[PDB]
Design an enzyme around this catalytic site. Sequence first.
Site, PDB file in Angstrom:
ATOM      1  N   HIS B  52       0.845  -1.181   0.000  1.00 57.12           N
ATOM      2  CA  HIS B  52       0.000   0.000   0.000  1.00 57.12           C
ATOM      3  C   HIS B  52       0.885   1.237   0.000  1.00 57.12           C
ATOM      4  O   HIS B  52       2.032   1.205   0.450  1.00 57.12           O
ATOM      5  CB  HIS B  52      -0.897   0.062   1.242  1.00 57.12           C
ATOM      6  CG  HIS B  52      -1.808  -1.114   1.415  1.00 57.12           C
ATOM      7  ND1 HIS B  52      -1.507  -2.172   2.252  1.00 57.12           N
ATOM      8  CD2 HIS B  52      -3.038  -1.376   0.905  1.00 57.12           C
ATOM      9  CE1 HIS B  52      -2.492  -3.054   2.215  1.00 57.12           C
ATOM     10  NE2 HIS B  52      -3.433  -2.596   1.408  1.00 57.12           N
ATOM     11  N   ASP B  55       1.939   1.890   3.545  1.00 54.83           N
ATOM     12  CA  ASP B  55       2.948   0.993   4.114  1.00 54.83           C
ATOM     13  C   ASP B  55       4.351   1.568   3.941  1.00 54.83           C
ATOM     14  O   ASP B  55       5.227   1.369   4.787  1.00 54.83           O
ATOM     15  CB  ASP B  55       2.899  -0.379   3.434  1.00 54.83           C
ATOM     16  CG  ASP B  55       1.599  -1.097   3.645  1.00 54.83           C
ATOM     17  OD1 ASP B  55       0.995  -0.949   4.719  1.00 54.83           O
ATOM     18  OD2 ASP B  55       1.181  -1.818   2.722  1.00 54.83           O
ATOM     19  N   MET B  86       3.165  -5.814  -7.831  1.00 55.89           N
ATOM     20  CA  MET B  86       1.823  -5.332  -7.557  1.00 55.89           C
ATOM     21  C   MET B  86       1.925  -4.241  -6.514  1.00 55.89           C
ATOM     22  O   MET B  86       2.755  -4.318  -5.603  1.00 55.89           O
ATOM     23  CB  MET B  86       0.909  -6.461  -7.057  1.00 55.89           C
ATOM     24  CG  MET B  86      -0.522  -6.041  -6.803  1.00 55.89           C
ATOM     25  SD  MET B  86      -0.756  -5.329  -5.153  1.00 55.89           S
ATOM     26  CE  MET B  86      -0.856  -6.795  -4.129  1.00 55.89           C
ATOM     27  N   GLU B 179     -10.350  -6.486  -5.973  1.00 53.16           N
ATOM     28  CA  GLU B 179     -10.302  -7.524  -4.944  1.00 53.16           C
ATOM     29  C   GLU B 179     -11.623  -7.558  -4.186  1.00 53.16           C
ATOM     30  O   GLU B 179     -11.947  -6.591  -3.476  1.00 53.16           O
ATOM     31  CB  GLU B 179      -9.140  -7.270  -3.981  1.00 53.16           C
ATOM     32  CG  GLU B 179      -9.034  -8.293  -2.877  1.00 53.16           C
ATOM     33  CD  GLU B 179      -7.841  -8.081  -1.984  1.00 53.16           C
ATOM     34  OE1 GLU B 179      -6.830  -7.498  -2.442  1.00 53.16           O
ATOM     35  OE2 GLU B 179      -7.924  -8.501  -0.812  1.00 53.16           O
ATOM     36  N   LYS B 181     -14.474  -8.708  -1.313  1.00 50.86           N
ATOM     37  CA  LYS B 181     -14.599  -9.147   0.067  1.00 50.86           C
ATOM     38  C   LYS B 181     -16.050  -8.930   0.454  1.00 50.86           C
ATOM     39  O   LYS B 181     -16.600  -7.869   0.132  1.00 50.86           O
ATOM     40  CB  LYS B 181     -13.677  -8.353   0.992  1.00 50.86           C
ATOM     41  CG  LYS B 181     -13.736  -8.812   2.416  1.00 50.86           C
ATOM     42  CD  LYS B 181     -12.713  -8.137   3.295  1.00 50.86           C
ATOM     43  CE  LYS B 181     -12.501  -8.936   4.571  1.00 50.86           C
ATOM     44  NZ  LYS B 181     -11.477  -8.317   5.437  1.00 50.86           N
ATOM     45  N   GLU B 215      -9.240 -13.561  -3.177  1.00 48.90           N
ATOM     46  CA  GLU B 215      -8.512 -14.011  -1.997  1.00 48.90           C
ATOM     47  C   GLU B 215      -9.188 -15.236  -1.401  1.00 48.90           C
ATOM     48  O   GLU B 215     -10.418 -15.265  -1.262  1.00 48.90           O
ATOM     49  CB  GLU B 215      -8.438 -12.903  -0.954  1.00 48.90           C
ATOM     50  CG  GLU B 215      -7.733 -13.310   0.320  1.00 48.90           C
ATOM     51  CD  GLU B 215      -7.275 -12.102   1.107  1.00 48.90           C
ATOM     52  OE1 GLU B 215      -7.568 -11.999   2.321  1.00 48.90           O
ATOM     53  OE2 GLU B 215      -6.640 -11.236   0.489  1.00 48.90           O
ATOM     54  N   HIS B 218     -11.534 -14.667   1.529  1.00 47.27           N
ATOM     55  CA  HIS B 218     -12.674 -13.793   1.266  1.00 47.27           C
ATOM     56  C   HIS B 218     -13.858 -14.575   0.705  1.00 47.27           C
ATOM     57  O   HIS B 218     -14.975 -14.493   1.233  1.00 47.27           O
ATOM     58  CB  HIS B 218     -12.261 -12.660   0.328  1.00 47.27           C
ATOM     59  CG  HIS B 218     -11.326 -11.673   0.967  1.00 47.27           C
ATOM     60  ND1 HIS B 218     -10.926 -10.507   0.348  1.00 47.27           N
ATOM     61  CD2 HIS B 218     -10.702 -11.692   2.167  1.00 47.27           C
ATOM     62  CE1 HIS B 218     -10.104  -9.847   1.144  1.00 47.27           C
ATOM     63  NE2 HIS B 218      -9.958 -10.538   2.260  1.00 47.27           N
ATOM     64  N   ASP B 243      -4.548 -13.818  -4.221  1.00 47.92           N
ATOM     65  CA  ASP B 243      -4.096 -13.692  -2.839  1.00 47.92           C
ATOM     66  C   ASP B 243      -4.337 -15.006  -2.111  1.00 47.92           C
ATOM     67  O   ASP B 243      -5.476 -15.473  -2.034  1.00 47.92           O
ATOM     68  CB  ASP B 243      -4.841 -12.580  -2.090  1.00 47.92           C
ATOM     69  CG  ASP B 243      -4.430 -11.193  -2.520  1.00 47.92           C
ATOM     70  OD1 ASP B 243      -3.489 -11.055  -3.335  1.00 47.92           O
ATOM     71  OD2 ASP B 243      -5.069 -10.237  -2.032  1.00 47.92           O
ATOM     72  N   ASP B 253     -12.422 -12.328   9.243  1.00 52.89           N
ATOM     73  CA  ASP B 253     -11.308 -12.575   8.326  1.00 52.89           C
ATOM     74  C   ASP B 253     -10.081 -13.031   9.117  1.00 52.89           C
ATOM     75  O   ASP B 253      -9.499 -12.242   9.858  1.00 52.89           O
ATOM     76  CB  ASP B 253     -11.025 -11.302   7.527  1.00 52.89           C
ATOM     77  CG  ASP B 253     -10.156 -11.532   6.320  1.00 52.89           C
ATOM     78  OD1 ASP B 253     -10.153 -12.656   5.762  1.00 52.89           O
ATOM     79  OD2 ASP B 253      -9.473 -10.554   5.933  1.00 52.89           O
ATOM     80  N   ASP B 255      -7.039 -14.529   7.945  1.00 55.61           N
ATOM     81  CA  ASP B 255      -5.722 -14.360   7.310  1.00 55.61           C
ATOM     82  C   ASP B 255      -4.687 -15.350   7.850  1.00 55.61           C
ATOM     83  O   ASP B 255      -3.547 -14.975   8.133  1.00 55.61           O
ATOM     84  CB  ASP B 255      -5.194 -12.932   7.465  1.00 55.61           C
ATOM     85  CG  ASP B 255      -6.018 -11.912   6.719  1.00 55.61           C
ATOM     86  OD1 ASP B 255      -6.640 -12.262   5.693  1.00 55.61           O
ATOM     87  OD2 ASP B 255      -6.042 -10.748   7.172  1.00 55.61           O
ATOM     88  N   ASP B 285      -1.370 -12.933   1.201  1.00 54.34           N
ATOM     89  CA  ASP B 285      -1.930 -11.847   1.994  1.00 54.34           C
ATOM     90  C   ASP B 285      -2.368 -12.475   3.315  1.00 54.34           C
ATOM     91  O   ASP B 285      -3.486 -12.969   3.443  1.00 54.34           O
ATOM     92  CB  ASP B 285      -3.069 -11.181   1.262  1.00 54.34           C
ATOM     93  CG  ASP B 285      -3.679 -10.047   2.041  1.00 54.34           C
ATOM     94  OD1 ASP B 285      -3.097  -9.612   3.062  1.00 54.34           O
ATOM     95  OD2 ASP B 285      -4.767  -9.599   1.638  1.00 54.34           O
TER      96      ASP B 285
HETATM   97 MG    MG Z   1      -5.847  -8.895   0.097  1.00 52.54          MG
HETATM   98 MG    MG Z   2      -8.086 -10.533   4.307  1.00 52.01          MG
END
Ligand code: MG
Ligand code: MG
Lengths: 384, 384, 384, 384
Positions: B52, B55, B86, B179, B181, B215, B218, B243, B253, B255, B285
């Site tokens: 990002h 980030d 990416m 993406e 979600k 993802e 997701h 992802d 979520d 992860d 991710d």
């Molecule tokens: Mg993601």
């Molecule tokens: Mg996630």
Amino acid sequence: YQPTPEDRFTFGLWTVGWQGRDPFGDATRRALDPVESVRRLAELGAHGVTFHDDDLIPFGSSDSEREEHVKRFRQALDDTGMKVPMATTNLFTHPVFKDGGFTANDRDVRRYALRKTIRNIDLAVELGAETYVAWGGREGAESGGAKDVRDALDRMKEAFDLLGEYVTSQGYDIRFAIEPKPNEPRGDILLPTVGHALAFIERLERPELYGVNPEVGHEQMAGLNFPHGIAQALWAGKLFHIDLNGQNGIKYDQDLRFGAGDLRAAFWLVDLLESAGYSGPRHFDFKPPRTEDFDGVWASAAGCMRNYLILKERAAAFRADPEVQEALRASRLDELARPTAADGLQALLDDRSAFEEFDVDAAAARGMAFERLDQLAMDHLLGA
Amino acid sequence: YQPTPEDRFTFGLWTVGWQGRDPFGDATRRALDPVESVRRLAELGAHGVTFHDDDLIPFGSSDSEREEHVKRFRQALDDTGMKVPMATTNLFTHPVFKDGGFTANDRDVRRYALRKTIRNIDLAVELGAETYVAWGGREGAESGGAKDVRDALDRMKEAFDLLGEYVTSQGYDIRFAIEPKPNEPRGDILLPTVGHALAFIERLERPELYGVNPEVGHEQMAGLNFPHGIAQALWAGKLFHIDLNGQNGIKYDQDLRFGAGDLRAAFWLVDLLESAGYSGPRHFDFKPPRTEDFDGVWASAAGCMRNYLILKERAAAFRADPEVQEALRASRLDELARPTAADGLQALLDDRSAFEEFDVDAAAARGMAFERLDQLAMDHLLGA
Amino acid sequence: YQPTPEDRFTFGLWTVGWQGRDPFGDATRRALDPVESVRRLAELGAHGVTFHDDDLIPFGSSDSEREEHVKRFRQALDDTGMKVPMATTNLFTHPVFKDGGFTANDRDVRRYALRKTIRNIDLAVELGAETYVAWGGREGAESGGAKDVRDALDRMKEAFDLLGEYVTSQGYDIRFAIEPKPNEPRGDILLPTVGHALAFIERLERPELYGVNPEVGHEQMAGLNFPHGIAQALWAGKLFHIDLNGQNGIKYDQDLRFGAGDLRAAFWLVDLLESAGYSGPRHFDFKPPRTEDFDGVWASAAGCMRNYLILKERAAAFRADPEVQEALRASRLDELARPTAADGLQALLDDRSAFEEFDVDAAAARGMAFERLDQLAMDHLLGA
Amino acid sequence: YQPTPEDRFTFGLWTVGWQGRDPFGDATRRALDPVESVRRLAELGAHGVTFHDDDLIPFGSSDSEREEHVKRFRQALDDTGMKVPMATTNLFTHPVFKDGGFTANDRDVRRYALRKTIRNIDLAVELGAETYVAWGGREGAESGGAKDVRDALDRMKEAFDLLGEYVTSQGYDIRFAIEPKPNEPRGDILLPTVGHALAFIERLERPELYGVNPEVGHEQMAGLNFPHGIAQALWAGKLFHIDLNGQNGIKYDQDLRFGAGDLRAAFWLVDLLESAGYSGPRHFDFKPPRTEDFDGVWASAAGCMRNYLILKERAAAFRADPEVQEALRASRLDELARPTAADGLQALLDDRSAFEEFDVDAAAARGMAFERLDQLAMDHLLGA
Ligand SMILES: [Mg+2]
Ligand SMILES: [Mg+2]
Ligand SMILES: [Mg+2]
Ligand SMILES: [Mg+2]
Ligand SMILES: [Mg+2]
Ligand SMILES: [Mg+2]
Ligand SMILES: [Mg+2]
Ligand SMILES: [Mg+2]
């Protein structure tokens, strides 16, 4: 709250006619004659009925018995004024369809499913149906190696393109509506949501012949927001038809009567349909619970229409309230309708108030006032 | 099972750099310098990293500090050989984005989100990114009256069209990946699944610039079949990026690292990606659980790649097995790949073996032999 | 619908005081002084407030600052008439609690969690709390090998027995209420539902000191029927306390205001609590959405109480309706209250009308008339 | 991986005998003679079979036909060496049970359900069954006003107490196991999870006669952790019996073969059962998918046992690995087994290292090393 046939309430024959057989139980009710269902629904204020081919003509009927069932059915429609706006194919009951119809691994089964469908389209046109619904209830898999989904999607596209070729060939004024469902009776079903169906339509040869027929409880079996899904379908121009019922969260397909299940979602649904000016049938695809006798069957079907009518009144009062209209401006719903950058890309890049001079902290400090707006919606739903 | 940079494993800086702050807890780990993450991931066998904007460049950095962070980051990439395939925008952390970025009700916020994105695309191109990911994490609603979804979809289309105008304007060789979600942090999120995103892309001005970035966790938060979703994305030509992580069913979520969660789904996923010849990055991710110290952070990231490599070996053995190849013919996967009616509509209508002479009971009696095939897949997954 | 302090509405300080920090976002609101929250809630008609230890006394306060926070808080209660019926321990925010408090693998952490709790019980008694709530938010696991659940249950029993020894030791008139939650922030949490907590209490040394504190949204995160769970808790005599909010199905913990979420479930809940004569606090454990400013905070808290009051009126009208009272007899709710075999086992075995002469088909043919009853409940909820 | 009858694999007659009728489809397979199922399962290595009363004796059989079915069945057991460790009652198929058996609103139906059960207990004892399972599949409701759950729980307690009086009366050496299920075929089912059943048992007159019979897919239909549930049942001493199958998340009851569904959960399950020394039957309550012919039926049943045997080998290797044994000490699983305060309450209160001198930051900084441990568990599951 009495239904008028202008309200365009329609029912599937298989709905009030469901005998109550479920995975762990035998039938609790005798079978209904399609003629009696038409009569009973007409007295209740329904506008029309819909059918699978096998609801009307018992599977394996000679041409003689077929025409006899059709003429008895047609007589019942003449006597009541009932219409038949939608028809569909049973491609899921018979054991031959145990791996699907359009996407069975066996090629001869796929051919047979196309032919069985084609025969019912002709009948649907004769009875005046405007929409032909396809529910691929057996297109899917319980295990991963059983279905190559890219191949299966090739066969699904192929079937729908051939059907569109046919209606074009015959000059038929009829359009197709694909009905998504994420699971049951297959462990996973292909085209599982409204989005998956919308995406797929865009790959067909004649996309303008094809829309979606979303069902309340189906999108809710994936925990999705049904009004959100309908709005994306309207925005794309593809809401040809709709199936109304209730469902209590992520579990087996309940087919509760409409307004049971997630009540606030039914409210936001009606509000959307009424405000968007949706003019198709209000179709109920529901199952009177198997606890009921026939008097409970008809009470449940009456309840479907009553609850639509109550919510419609409540949503109309909510949008008409001046205090709601000011609440909507307070939450900036008016600004959401305005273009972000009608001035264009270059003006955006040179607009220093859009980045360099933007007071990000002042913007972040404005509350959205969504909780006041939602309580007004609550107050209106409850009639407080 | 040691990763090669030909395996194209990539990580988000925010993944191994997650400090462990969750809804009910404070950070358990200190912040990571992006430079140290690049070094540590390079030693582990990673091919590249993603970011990002926030980030890399702390939110609110002057041009001087911005260029300093970029040059330090760029030095770390030169020293390790790491690539940046990416990049993406943070349009969800800052309070200004509390009602969304591209679909905020406030028009000035929408303009600012477009500008913040545009600034990061320029940077992404400079660092060599080929894909620009958009995750609308705050585009949605907790209550029904707060967002007109048709209007919101107008604003979403508008934002993506302007971004495509920009990249076209600048001659940029970069494509967008949306993406999906379904929820969290909004109660419902717009474009909730792969299907909803695919459908929406087809309404954009230049659809060929836009794909999806699905993802694992997701689609699994809606209880959907992730390999099925990926196959529909490949069939449509839109799988630009992916992802990888794990998730245990319908809940918040998680992860988890890849291969944790639904293991058999990870197997069928790898099998699909390898057999379809997917050539993009294998992007993780994920969030090392906040129970871990930094040594656990790096063990978890190593586990992501190891599990991909083990499953890839197992899927390759499964498809190479002659006994599996005969099992697939026994379940007629070969017939699913053959056109249903290459002979055409008219031949179908006159083919009496497709309906009039079709022995429906003989067809229904053939078992599919799917359970034998699935046990072979099991036997192969487990190495038995 | 104005709240009276006889309505016993109570709020957690952490509820209206939630700053809006979520997994993907920073705070949207400044922190609230506990004193101002007491004043604002008193003006709204609340009866009392509740607290975690760390809500009131910032973590790591010297005895001097501790007593100063307590005396300021106590002054606010004197000035408003507000009561403190319930208190609880924060055993989940600080990094030291990342593997749990009572069931951390590290023994020294478990000891520290017991001591931190004991210190807050003393304070709770001083402020007049009657119920001490325990929410083991970090007791659980993300992976299978991390926690031996039998050992963890030994440590959980041990902690609760020691706490009961303490209150007994000190002559304290206070009882414990265990609050279940199935997941989040741990991937799975121990004692995940009302049933799991009820079962566990029966293994404690002094079970009569321990009840449950169920939360609407928690049982709904497992898709369970919250009124059903409460009824089992009342039937067992263990409903010491209750947490009210709303939740839209199986997903992350939303903490919507009460009456949002599953509206028909809130109705059946209120009906149960009112009819059963539940006399404890009506406690709201909710989060004003982070879209809101402080005016939205107070509107949302007001909405909690208003919606309880509206539903209470509607449930009271539903049970008072003579037509409902006759509907209940029609569905044989009166017979469900009558003993199956007050005559005894031997009389049952010799009663030929109970098996040999029982007309099973006549019995099966009686409809239950549940759909008429439910529409009356609907008609009453909506005020039609 | 060949099953030995020491492995105590048992099957329900209704499992391999399921004809494939589902909510939307007719039977795909002919009915199986109980005698042939006993023979086929014996050849596969099964230890025994179980039955509902109506699986064995068609509903409505005269005493003459009843005894004839029993003697044919008994002959098949003599010829194969097969045992019958468990039996149960069908209280859900017949329309008379449409509102439940033990908790039907109609009193005469409740009496009849008690008598039908009592008659099958006598038979179960004669065939040597040690456990009698009760699955209240129809005890519940689709709507809120239809069932007073406190009254229903009074009737449920009453039925189970009378059954315990009976077995006590007759000197029967047999114990009851309650099987929970959260939903389907009722919209919500009473005693929905292992916890709810455990809690309820503690209210019965003779609790020591009653345990639970959890099913993999049932706890997983509420998204709960099945190994966690089993561990709480073992900790309470109530795991009398267990039903093994697979299920892919929150949706309709799939009854996949064991090891399909959530594979990592099956691994952690086997590990728990083997390490805890569970000595009861390994019972498979599963449905060969209706895609299969009889050869697929037997392949699927074989797959149930094979997958248990593979996982058992993998879990035994995981616990035997010295590197795993050191990983467990690294995550302090050894400390979780040690009493928190064997020294007692007063010593705890005066232990300054437990609060006053406790270095909270040092404690919080220790990582748990759970991700390394989980990858070793993965490495072991996969045989890497
Ligand atoms: Mg993601
Ligand atoms: Mg996630
Ligand atoms: Mg349905
Ligand atoms: Mg439908
Ligand atoms: Mg909560
Ligand atoms: Mg709470
Ligand atoms: Mg089952
Ligand atoms: Mg079972």
